[PDB]
Ligand binder design. Sequence first.
Ligand SMILES: *[C@@H]1O[C@H](CO)[C@@H](O[C@@H]2O[C@H](CO)[C@@H](O[C@@H]3O[C@H](CO[C@H]4O[C@H](CO)[C@@H](O)[C@H](O)[C@@H]4O)[C@@H](O)[C@H](O[C@H]4O[C@H](CO)[C@@H](O)[C@H](O)[C@@H]4O[C@H]4O[C@H](CO)[C@@H](O)[C@H](O)[C@@H]4O)[C@@H]3O)[C@H](O)[C@H]2NC(C)=O)[C@H](O)[C@H]1NC(C)=O
Ligand SMILES: *[C@@H]1O[C@H](CO)[C@@H](O[C@@H]2O[C@H](CO)[C@@H](O[C@@H]3O[C@H](CO[C@H]4O[C@H](CO)[C@@H](O)[C@H](O)[C@@H]4O)[C@@H](O)[C@H](O[C@H]4O[C@H](CO)[C@@H](O)[C@H](O)[C@@H]4O)[C@@H]3O)[C@H](O)[C@H]2NC(C)=O)[C@H](O)[C@H]1NC(C)=O
Ligand SMILES: *[C@@H]1O[C@H](CO)[C@@H](O[C@@H]2O[C@H](CO)[C@@H](O[C@@H]3O[C@H](CO)[C@@H](O)[C@H](O[C@H]4O[C@H](CO)[C@@H](O)[C@H](O)[C@@H]4O)[C@@H]3O)[C@H](O)[C@H]2NC(C)=O)[C@H](O)[C@H]1NC(C)=O
Ligand SMILES: *[C@@H]1O[C@H](CO)[C@@H](O[C@@H]2O[C@H](CO)[C@@H](O[C@@H]3O[C@H](CO[C@H]4O[C@H](CO)[C@@H](O)[C@H](O)[C@@H]4O)[C@@H](O)[C@H](O)[C@@H]3O)[C@H](O)[C@H]2NC(C)=O)[C@H](O)[C@H]1NC(C)=O
Ligand SMILES: *[C@@H]1O[C@H](CO)[C@@H](O[C@@H]2O[C@H](CO)[C@@H](O[C@@H]3O[C@H](CO[C@H]4O[C@H](CO)[C@@H](O)[C@H](O)[C@@H]4O)[C@@H](O)[C@H](O)[C@@H]3O)[C@H](O)[C@H]2NC(C)=O)[C@H](O)[C@H]1NC(C)=O
Ligand SMILES: *[C@@H]1O[C@H](CO)[C@@H](O[C@@H]2O[C@H](CO)[C@@H](O[C@@H]3O[C@H](CO[C@H]4O[C@H](CO)[C@@H](O)[C@H](O)[C@@H]4O)[C@@H](O)[C@H](O)[C@@H]3O)[C@H](O)[C@H]2NC(C)=O)[C@H](O)[C@H]1NC(C)=O
Ligand SMILES: *[C@@H]1O[C@H](CO)[C@@H](O[C@@H]2O[C@H](CO)[C@@H](O[C@@H]3O[C@H](CO)[C@@H](O)[C@H](O)[C@@H]3O)[C@H](O)[C@H]2NC(C)=O)[C@H](O)[C@H]1NC(C)=O
Ligand SMILES: *[C@@H]1O[C@H](CO)[C@@H](O[C@@H]2O[C@H](CO)[C@@H](O[C@@H]3O[C@H](CO)[C@@H](O)[C@H](O)[C@@H]3O)[C@H](O)[C@H]2NC(C)=O)[C@H](O)[C@H]1NC(C)=O
Ligand SMILES: *[C@@H]1O[C@H](CO)[C@@H](O[C@@H]2O[C@H](CO)[C@@H](O[C@@H]3O[C@H](CO)[C@@H](O)[C@H](O)[C@@H]3O)[C@H](O)[C@H]2NC(C)=O)[C@H](O)[C@H]1NC(C)=O
Ligand SMILES: *[C@@H]1O[C@H](CO)[C@@H](O[C@@H]2O[C@H](CO)[C@@H](O[C@@H]3O[C@H](CO)[C@@H](O)[C@H](O)[C@@H]3O)[C@H](O)[C@H]2NC(C)=O)[C@H](O)[C@H]1NC(C)=O
Ligand SMILES: *[C@@H]1O[C@H](CO)[C@@H](O[C@@H]2O[C@H](CO)[C@@H](O[C@@H]3O[C@H](CO)[C@@H](O)[C@H](O)[C@@H]3O)[C@H](O)[C@H]2NC(C)=O)[C@H](O)[C@H]1NC(C)=O
Ligand SMILES: *[C@@H]1O[C@H](CO)[C@@H](O[C@@H]2O[C@H](CO)[C@@H](O[C@@H]3O[C@H](CO)[C@@H](O)[C@H](O)[C@@H]3O)[C@H](O)[C@H]2NC(C)=O)[C@H](O)[C@H]1NC(C)=O
Ligand SMILES: *[C@@H]1O[C@H](CO)[C@@H](O[C@@H]2O[C@H](CO)[C@@H](O)[C@H](O)[C@H]2NC(C)=O)[C@H](O)[C@H]1NC(C)=O
Ligand SMILES: *[C@@H]1O[C@H](CO)[C@@H](O)[C@H](O)[C@H]1NC(C)=O
Ligand SMILES: *[C@@H]1O[C@H](CO)[C@@H](O)[C@H](O)[C@H]1NC(C)=O
Ligand SMILES: *[C@@H]1O[C@H](CO)[C@@H](O)[C@H](O)[C@H]1NC(C)=O
Lengths: 453, 107, 122, 122, 132, 132, 132
Amino acid sequence: AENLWVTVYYGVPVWKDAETTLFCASDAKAYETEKHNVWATHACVPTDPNPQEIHLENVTEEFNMWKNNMVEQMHTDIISLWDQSLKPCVKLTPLCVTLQCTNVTNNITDDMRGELKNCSFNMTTELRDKKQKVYSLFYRLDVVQINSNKEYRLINCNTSACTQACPKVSFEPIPIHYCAPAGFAILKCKDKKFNGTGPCPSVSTVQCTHGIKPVVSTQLLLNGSLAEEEVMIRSENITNNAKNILVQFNTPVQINCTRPNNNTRKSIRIGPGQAFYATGDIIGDIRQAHCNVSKATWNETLGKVVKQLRKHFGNNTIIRFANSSGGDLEVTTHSFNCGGEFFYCNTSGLFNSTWISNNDSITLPCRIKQIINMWQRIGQCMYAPPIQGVIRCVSNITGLILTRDGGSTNSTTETFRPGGGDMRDNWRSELYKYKVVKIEPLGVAPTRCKRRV
Amino acid sequence: DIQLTQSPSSLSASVGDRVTITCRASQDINTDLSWYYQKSGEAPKLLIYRASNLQSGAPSRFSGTGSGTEFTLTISSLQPEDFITYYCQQRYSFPITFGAGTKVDIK
Amino acid sequence: QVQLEESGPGIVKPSETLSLTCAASRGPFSGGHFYWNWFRQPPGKGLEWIGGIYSDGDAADYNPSLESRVAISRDRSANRFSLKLISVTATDTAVYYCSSTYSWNNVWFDQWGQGVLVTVSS
Amino acid sequence: QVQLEESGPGIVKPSETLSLTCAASRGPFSGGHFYWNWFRQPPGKGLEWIGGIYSDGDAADYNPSLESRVAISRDRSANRFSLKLISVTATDTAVYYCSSTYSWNNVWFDQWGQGVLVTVSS
Amino acid sequence: AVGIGAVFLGFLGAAGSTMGAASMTLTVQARNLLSGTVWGIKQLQARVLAVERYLRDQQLLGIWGCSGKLICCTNVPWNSSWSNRNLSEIWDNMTWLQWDKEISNYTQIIYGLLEESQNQQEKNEQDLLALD
Amino acid sequence: AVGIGAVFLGFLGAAGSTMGAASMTLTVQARNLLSGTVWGIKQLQARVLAVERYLRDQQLLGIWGCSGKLICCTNVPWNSSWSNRNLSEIWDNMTWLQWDKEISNYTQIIYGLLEESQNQQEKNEQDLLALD
Amino acid sequence: AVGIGAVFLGFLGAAGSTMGAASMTLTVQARNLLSGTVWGIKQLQARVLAVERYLRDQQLLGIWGCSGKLICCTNVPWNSSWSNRNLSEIWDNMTWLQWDKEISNYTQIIYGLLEESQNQQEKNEQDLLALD
Ligand SMILES: *[C@@H]1O[C@H](CO)[C@@H](O[C@@H]2O[C@H](CO)[C@@H](O[C@@H]3O[C@H](CO[C@H]4O[C@H](CO)[C@@H](O)[C@H](O)[C@@H]4O)[C@@H](O)[C@H](O[C@H]4O[C@H](CO)[C@@H](O)[C@H](O)[C@@H]4O[C@H]4O[C@H](CO)[C@@H](O)[C@H](O)[C@@H]4O)[C@@H]3O)[C@H](O)[C@H]2NC(C)=O)[C@H](O)[C@H]1NC(C)=O
Ligand SMILES: *[C@@H]1O[C@H](CO)[C@@H](O[C@@H]2O[C@H](CO)[C@@H](O[C@@H]3O[C@H](CO[C@H]4O[C@H](CO)[C@@H](O)[C@H](O)[C@@H]4O)[C@@H](O)[C@H](O[C@H]4O[C@H](CO)[C@@H](O)[C@H](O)[C@@H]4O)[C@@H]3O)[C@H](O)[C@H]2NC(C)=O)[C@H](O)[C@H]1NC(C)=O
Ligand SMILES: *[C@@H]1O[C@H](CO)[C@@H](O[C@@H]2O[C@H](CO)[C@@H](O[C@@H]3O[C@H](CO)[C@@H](O)[C@H](O[C@H]4O[C@H](CO)[C@@H](O)[C@H](O)[C@@H]4O)[C@@H]3O)[C@H](O)[C@H]2NC(C)=O)[C@H](O)[C@H]1NC(C)=O
Ligand SMILES: *[C@@H]1O[C@H](CO)[C@@H](O[C@@H]2O[C@H](CO)[C@@H](O[C@@H]3O[C@H](CO[C@H]4O[C@H](CO)[C@@H](O)[C@H](O)[C@@H]4O)[C@@H](O)[C@H](O)[C@@H]3O)[C@H](O)[C@H]2NC(C)=O)[C@H](O)[C@H]1NC(C)=O
Ligand SMILES: *[C@@H]1O[C@H](CO)[C@@H](O[C@@H]2O[C@H](CO)[C@@H](O[C@@H]3O[C@H](CO[C@H]4O[C@H](CO)[C@@H](O)[C@H](O)[C@@H]4O)[C@@H](O)[C@H](O)[C@@H]3O)[C@H](O)[C@H]2NC(C)=O)[C@H](O)[C@H]1NC(C)=O
Ligand SMILES: *[C@@H]1O[C@H](CO)[C@@H](O[C@@H]2O[C@H](CO)[C@@H](O[C@@H]3O[C@H](CO[C@H]4O[C@H](CO)[C@@H](O)[C@H](O)[C@@H]4O)[C@@H](O)[C@H](O)[C@@H]3O)[C@H](O)[C@H]2NC(C)=O)[C@H](O)[C@H]1NC(C)=O
Ligand SMILES: *[C@@H]1O[C@H](CO)[C@@H](O[C@@H]2O[C@H](CO)[C@@H](O[C@@H]3O[C@H](CO)[C@@H](O)[C@H](O)[C@@H]3O)[C@H](O)[C@H]2NC(C)=O)[C@H](O)[C@H]1NC(C)=O
Ligand SMILES: *[C@@H]1O[C@H](CO)[C@@H](O[C@@H]2O[C@H](CO)[C@@H](O[C@@H]3O[C@H](CO)[C@@H](O)[C@H](O)[C@@H]3O)[C@H](O)[C@H]2NC(C)=O)[C@H](O)[C@H]1NC(C)=O
Ligand SMILES: *[C@@H]1O[C@H](CO)[C@@H](O[C@@H]2O[C@H](CO)[C@@H](O[C@@H]3O[C@H](CO)[C@@H](O)[C@H](O)[C@@H]3O)[C@H](O)[C@H]2NC(C)=O)[C@H](O)[C@H]1NC(C)=O
Ligand SMILES: *[C@@H]1O[C@H](CO)[C@@H](O[C@@H]2O[C@H](CO)[C@@H](O[C@@H]3O[C@H](CO)[C@@H](O)[C@H](O)[C@@H]3O)[C@H](O)[C@H]2NC(C)=O)[C@H](O)[C@H]1NC(C)=O
Ligand SMILES: *[C@@H]1O[C@H](CO)[C@@H](O[C@@H]2O[C@H](CO)[C@@H](O[C@@H]3O[C@H](CO)[C@@H](O)[C@H](O)[C@@H]3O)[C@H](O)[C@H]2NC(C)=O)[C@H](O)[C@H]1NC(C)=O
Ligand SMILES: *[C@@H]1O[C@H](CO)[C@@H](O[C@@H]2O[C@H](CO)[C@@H](O[C@@H]3O[C@H](CO)[C@@H](O)[C@H](O)[C@@H]3O)[C@H](O)[C@H]2NC(C)=O)[C@H](O)[C@H]1NC(C)=O
Ligand SMILES: *[C@@H]1O[C@H](CO)[C@@H](O[C@@H]2O[C@H](CO)[C@@H](O)[C@H](O)[C@H]2NC(C)=O)[C@H](O)[C@H]1NC(C)=O
Ligand SMILES: *[C@@H]1O[C@H](CO)[C@@H](O)[C@H](O)[C@H]1NC(C)=O
Ligand SMILES: *[C@@H]1O[C@H](CO)[C@@H](O)[C@H](O)[C@H]1NC(C)=O
Ligand SMILES: *[C@@H]1O[C@H](CO)[C@@H](O)[C@H](O)[C@H]1NC(C)=O
């Protein structure tokens, strides 16, 4: 009776932390046409119409958003897929020619003085021996003067040659799911008060994660998820100011971003089957692109954020908001995409407030750049084609990326400024609740049974 | 509503006697019917499931037959524990209805 | 292995609101649909069906005769489900049962429990 | 499991053409080579070999003494094979057998059948 | 159609249950272990890696004379040095994850002991059968 | 060299034969199941897919306690609801394809029943052996 | 720490030993059989080829009714035509490589004989068990 032996159990319900390669999966609705997109949906396996989520009763799991391989893996996957999508498109090397540029006095407002430049230049046609003199419009942030006459060149000409994006390809983000392969499991922490790291008692297993939209943004988290309980704050080290702070909103903030200029697209034949899309004459008035938010909603969201921050930095602390300290335009401005056009918005009007221990709309200006060096890479630039007509988009602000200024001793005040620059922080807001584990079906146990001799 | 009629309403028999209970449905329900057994003081328990697949743990002396609007529960040999009340329940589309109930008493 | 327990007031005055609550259990089964159902067994007559609710959905089914008087809700955090009956009459005096039926492959289990007595009197 | 049946005229006049036909069968075996062979067993003496044909080829092998008088053909649609002997003499009166030998791995089966009697007389 | 569903023993959702209670759902996870030019190659590599992992586990099971069986008793004695405990508190109070955490140190020696015992048993059985 | 050839039991050429007669050639097809940068990857993917299919079939066979055996009896009763028929007309008149067509509807429930029966049998055998 | 090391039965280093002596180290080599976009594809192809080779060997072992066993006796008689010799000089004087060189000619007929014998044994066992 007391004597007992060892027995082997297979297919056992145990796991351990591990890193592997997941695979993409997209909804069947994307299969209905729309086969031309940056985020390849034809290459993704169709998703489960009724995904299964199995709750793990009596299970507590340790999660760590910051040391998660999924964020880096999917960032690399996005970069590679973007490069692959841009590979077959037209290579815009002939544009690197001297341009004769003048100002645009075509009913421009006072704030748009010098932003647009009318540039004429020679270019090769379908026949190399022949050349054509053509004119276009370029934003001030896309041309640099070279030294009477005024000669300008594309900003990228001394760095690399851009690859014009194929017009048929859509920049619109689509929901994406990541599924672990066989032998691996994905764990989701269902706790509504989870702060991004530590133990989680409410856990479940899912083959595929929920739909994730790879939205590219800085200083803001557009079209993201919303915390069920209230506004939440996550940080690798809240005390350390060198670490970014991710803020998730309980309720979205509606933001309307518009470019009111009636742009015109003009096709130029660079060579055999090479088409270049240029910005022609603008019909009508010219006005600065701008984004609008609700003042009252933003104020209430900032108040909730201030309360939740005081929950970590002490009740009697002055909470101040300041704009970005400085640097390149990518991090100093809210940079994102809207209907195929890239916007760089000056957010000094949204982080300008001070909070003591106790129908109006905010309008902020935005600038347009047709040449983009995203992912902080150098030597790979894309020329964004112009889009005819006005541009209007309505989005949800659901999160913020903030940085705390280093305060000397205890100055009973704290200043937070928009930051970012690393898309991994943007990705971490959606994959915080997900972890990857590897199964170990083998298991030895003590059992009184003894195999026959 | 689907009306279930049980016959006999009340029956008296001795131990070991073979007994039969018949249930009629107001409309066709195919083979989606079951029979439950209950005694006063305890909750009803399933006796025969689908009228053709013996429920696990139930004695083999109970047999279910029939389909459509006619179902039959047959007990080949009565037992002291078998002097219970039997109900027929249609596992068809809603609403859900139960039989009138047949009472078995010792004679 | 699901055991369901019933709670509520033993005596409810006529035309008042009768509220009963039962503890939902899932047993060894990890994923699926559980149909938590409320019944009643008035003395001297057979059992009657009141209503039911799915585990994965808030949709509720009710007996046609009690559609306007019977409501059933659930709370997953406490894993409970409650039944509220309004305009209680003398005929509502019954043994109320909370039941769950498994739906494993071609077996169709069923568990009921013990129930609770409810009496309507002034 | 191959059973071979023989057909043809019981009596053939001398110097005429003797035509015999046999039904070829493959049995449970699905792929391979079947050597359908024709023999003869004259009364009062041992068996003799006439010729043979492969299942997968039309090439025919014949006994050296009967090369100029014996021909064998086959038709796969009817799965039959026929033997034609010309200038039949009194010595050709024999029991003609159609045989097939299996060639499974290192076994070398052999099936013969029952044969047919052929008599040469005027 | 009376409110029935699936109620199927699914994924590791039973891992939080006890040892013996969780032994019910071993086969479903065992079956799940085989659920099913820059991205297709990576997903194919993941599939092949899962295949090798499962096949190596099956080979390890077969080497110990337990092929084709989820549960297989063995002749190796259970030394109390690893974890004494007792049978009652193991199969009714502790979960599989806690047991794996506790016994993660001595797994290799257990594998080697099972290997050696199975080889010796196979040779002894061969000799005994050749004797008859 | 007397006219002999191969006469080997080959591919599905025996599928048109009866049930019992076609049971002879199960192993040859079982062996055939493993017959053996834009095109090599595709052919490798086809090979890996065949490998996963065969390995999943082997796992299913092992889960029902029938690993390593082409023919393995089981404890699951044969309910007459699926197809009553009788033994004589099945193994001597009907082919495998017709049987698969007839019984294609209830395959999953058969697989589940075999799974549950094998698990119960394994646990009962473990308890019985531990009793001794 | 008194000068001890590993002293583990490793790779084919025991191949030069005798038949029976080398039978000790069969399982270590069996385990080693699964040791583990222009170059990764080639190494993946090598891994997949090794996987198919091992799986085909396992399928061949299972077809002869010897799955999960390193050593498995069979009902096929040992014809003296292949290599008469005698038992004493085989398992104590000749190595595995020499035996493989000697018997390399008739391997296929042995495989076929084992196949046919196992199929016949399986059918006879099925009939006998159905009789009871
Ligand atoms: C957060 O999430 C929100 C909500 O989804 C999202 O807003 C949506 O943005 C997308 C992408 O810009 C918008 O889709 C575009 O909308 C307009 C108009 O089309 C829609 O609206 C009309 C009327 O409502 C409908 O009839 C119509 O069916 C559409 O619903 C267009 O700009 C776009 O269509 C062109 O582009 C597509 C590219 O995929 C083409 O498939 C399509 O054929 C159109 O191209 C053609 O016309 C172009 C102009 O003439 C021309 O240049 C092309 O060559 C071609 O001929 C597209 O449908 C969507 O409407 C927004 N939703 C709402 C409710 O406003 C936010 O953008 C998102 N935020 C972030 C940061 O990602
Ligand atoms: C960016 O800069 C480019 C140049 O680098 C501008 O393009 C020029 O724009 C001007 C102003 O619109 C164009 O001039 C107009 O072109 C049209 C065609 O004119 C034809 O006829 C005249 C003779 O009648 C010929 O010389 C000419 O080659 C054409 O065959 C007409 O709309 C205009 O003619 C009308 O207005 C003039 C004004 O005095 C009258 O004299 C005429 O009788 C008539 O009523 C005028 O000639 C010019 O052609 C454009 N050049 C090119 C190469 O396209 C872009 O407009 C500028 N973009 C912005 C946003 O500012
Ligand atoms: C993002 O936007 C903010 C504002 O939303 C912007 O900060 C402003 O920058 C300007 C310079 O671009 C600062 O100077 C102003 O410039 C013009 C021209 O003089 C006028 O608007 C202002 O003058 C008025 O106000 C003065 C002081 O009240 C008066 O003396 C004068 O007579 C005029 O009335 C002013 O000089 C401007 O002060 C700031 N605004 C604030 C609130 O700090 C910021 O630069 C933008 N960021 C980027 C990167 O573009
Ligand atoms: C997560 O952990 C929970 C806490 O341990 C688990 O709850 C246990 O559930 C099992 C069945 O799965 C129960 O076992 C039954 O318990 C009683 C024995 O009576 C004792 O308990 C009752 C109620 O607690 C009490 O009134 C008595 O006085 C006794 O103390 C009987 O119904 C059965 O015989 C059977 O043994 C455990 O009692 C119960 N433990 C509790 C409630 O503390 C839960 O199952 C776990 N979840 C999973 C998915 O495994
Ligand atoms: C394709 O279908 C064919 C038609 O069913 C199959 O032919 C069958 O072949 C089997 C052997 O493989 C024969 O079984 C033998 O038959 C007789 C029994 O005697 C009866 O049949 C004969 C001839 O038809 C007749 O003269 C008698 O009166 C009886 O009626 C015996 O030789 C053996 O005992 C054995 O049972 C079938 O009889 C035969 N059926 C026919 C000709 O209708 C053919 O085999 C199938 N092909 C494959 C590849 O499976
Ligand atoms: C490589 O080949 C070598 C030569 O055959 C192998 O050496 C052999 O090693 C085995 C053990 O592994 C020895 O077996 C033992 O031998 C003696 C029997 O007595 C006889 O031999 C001794 C010494 O040679 C001699 O003094 C006596 O008179 C006898 O002739 C006993 O110790 C044991 O019972 C046991 O049988 C072989 O004798 C030995 N053969 C020699 C030395 O010729 C060597 O093991 C091989 N290497 C490998 C890795 O397998
Ligand atoms: C596109 O190609 C055309 C054609 O070659 C270029 O026009 C040429 O520009 C040069 C430099 O300004 C001109 O040379 C100068 O012209 C006048 C008249 O002689 C005078 O300022 C100077 O003495 C000098 O020679 C040249 O004449 C002119 N050619 C023509 C046919 O007009 C043009 O610069 C190129 N680039 C662009 C952006 O258009
Ligand atoms: C998110 O929540 C987790 C817990 O769910 C927080 O981790 C906890 O952090 C506190 C300090 O903030 C740790 O307390 C300290 O632990 C050690 C040992 O006692 C010592 O340094 C101190 O005396 C103090 O007690 C606590 O151990 C730790 N818990 C775990 C499980 O790691 C985490 O800090 C939260 N993150 C943010 C950004 O708020
Ligand atoms: C999160 O960030 C805080 C703030 O930086 C980290 O605390 C810091 O820990 C470092 C050592 O890792 C301390 O430096 C040492 O401090 C003392 C006093 O100077 C002395 O031992 C050494 O000379 C050295 O400077 C630093 O003072 C300390 N900062 C504060 C404000 O306490 C903390 O370790 C970080 N947590 C994690 C988990 O990374
Ligand atoms: C974002 O908010 C700004 C600021 O409120 C909006 O600009 C305002 O737009 C309205 C409606 O178009 C303009 O009113 C119109 O202006 C002219 C001149 O009177 C005329 O078209 C109409 O009679 C009407 O009054 C208003 O002037 C303009 N500016 C301001 C300072 O209010 C902008 O439209 C908003 N963008 C979106 C997409 O909602
Ligand atoms: C961003 O643009 C959206 C529309 O694309 C704006 O939402 C719209 O806001 C107007 C008022 O400005 C709403 O009209 C009013 O709605 C209700 C009845 O629906 C009632 O108060 C009035 O009779 C009037 O019709 C309109 O419904 C609403 N549309 C939607 C779809 O919500 C939004 O306000 C803009 N955001 C900012 C910050 O400017
Ligand atoms: C950032 O926040 C600060 C603090 O609230 C804002 O400064 C204040 O802005 C208001 C609105 O422009 C100024 O009021 C105006 O001032 C002058 C006369 O002083 C005149 O233009 C108007 O009659 C009106 O009263 C206020 O003076 C100014 N205060 C200071 C100390 O500068 C600032 O505008 C905010 N920035 C943004 C971009 O929203
Ligand atoms: C931008 O300008 C274009 C110029 O073509 C406008 O398109 C014209 O719109 C008018 C008015 O509806 C139509 O009668 C014309 O047929 C259109 N022309 C073409 C070529 O399509 C366009 O509407 C303007 N966009 C805005 C927002 O005002
Ligand atoms: C297991 O051993 C511990 C330690 O001696 C003891 O307290 C406990 O009761 C034992 N459990 C049993 C006997 O079930
Ligand atoms: C099989 O059953 C059918 C239908 O009753 C019957 O006609 C046939 O003879 C049976 N076959 C047997 C008994 O071999
Ligand atoms: C094996 O056979 C050979 C040849 O007859 C003989 O010399 C030798 O002694 C035999 N070995 C034995 C009997 O161990």
